[PDB]
Design brief:
Order of helices and strands: HHEEHHHHEEE
Subunit structure: Monomer.
Structural class: alpha+beta
Protein name: Photoactive yellow protein
Number of helices: 6
Function: Photoactive blue light protein. Probably functions as a photoreceptor for a negative phototaxis response.
CATH superfamily: PAS domain
Strand content: 25-35%
Number of strands: 5
GO molecular function, one term: photoreceptor activity
InterPro entries: PAS (IPR000014), PAS-like_dom_sf (IPR035965), PAS_fold (IPR013767), PYP (IPR012130)
Radius of gyration: 13 Å
Distance between the termini: 21 Å
Number of domains: 1
């Protein structure tokens, strides 16, 4: 198990070293998005929470295709403001409810160290 705590202040530095295999060892869900919301990485723990197969959602658009329930000012709105601004670090509770049992989560979105990519981290509450 890769030992990194949800909400750590340097999480983006820690995860910068990890390949898709190491990401699967985290204790929480992790999704890497580009600035348009397309999925670049999607780990095992996220699939355990949501039921999605990680291999199959890579390359889909999180807000349009995968997670329409997040297309709202309270989630996608925050994302697109952070991309436009070039900075993003916000944590909030949300309920995921699209084609799944409604599941309450804590979400942390943070700009990655790389270029034009953004993390979404998820854990159950």
């Amino acid at each position: 198990m890769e030992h990194v705590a949800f909400g750590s202040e340097d999480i983006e530095n820690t995860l910068a070293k990890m390949d898709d295999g190491q990401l699967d060892g985290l204790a929480f869900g992790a999704i890497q998005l580009d600035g348009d919301g397309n999925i670049l990485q999607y780990n095992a723990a996220e699939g355990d929470i949501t039921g999605r197969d990680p291999k199959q959602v890579i390359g889909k658009n999180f807000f349009k295709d995968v997670a329409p329930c997040t297309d709202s000012p309270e989630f996608y709105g925050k994302f697109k403001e952070g991309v436009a601004s070039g900075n993003l670090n916000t944590m909030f509770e949300y309920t995921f409810d699209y084609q799944m049992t409604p599941t309450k989560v804590k979400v942390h979105m943070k700009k990655a160290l790389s270029g034009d990519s953004y993390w979404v981290f998820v854990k159950r509450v």
